[PDB]
């Protein structure tokens, strides 16, 4: 659904790809775990490992990211957190 980016430490091109990738994952899967798995795997392939992705409706997080590889955004009511670390 509607993509809203709240925070980002990421280039403009990677930001759009993160949203697009999550959007496709959300279209294909209903289960958040499987949505996250799609998003993570695609990023490892295109932008090198190691990415991590969390998708959900209710959580708080405190994580560490590599510069230029973190985004936090919503698709409707579902939040997606994606970053590299390691």
């Amino acid at each position: 659904r509607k993509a809203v980016i709240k925070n980002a430490d990421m280039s403009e091109e990677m930001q759009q790809d993160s949203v697009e990738c999550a959007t496709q994952a959300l279209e294909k899967y209903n289960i958040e775990k499987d949505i996250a798995a799609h998003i993570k795997k695609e990023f490892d392939k295109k932008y090198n490992p190691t990415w991590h992705c969390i998708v959900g409706r209710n959580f708080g997080s405190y994580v560490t990211h590599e510069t230029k590889h973190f985004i936090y955004f919503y698709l409707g009511q579902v939040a997606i957190l994606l970053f590299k670390s390691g």
Binding site: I31, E32, K33, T50, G56, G86
Partner: protein, 46 residues
């Protein structure tokens, strides 16, 4: 006046292959469960 010919030889050596590797990673996946074992209205008599 006596020149003696001699032949010398040193011992050989042996090497071996080896490798190093830093710590390894592995993936993981989790799905949070949303159980709601909740009735509508239990008429309590506490």
């Amino acid at each position: 006046i006596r020149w003696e010919t001699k032949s010398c030889q040193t011992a050989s050596i042996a090497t071996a292959s080896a490798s190093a590797q830093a710590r390894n990673h592995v993936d993981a996946q989790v799905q949070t469960e949303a159980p709601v074992p909740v009735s509508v209205q239990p008429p309590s008599q506490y």
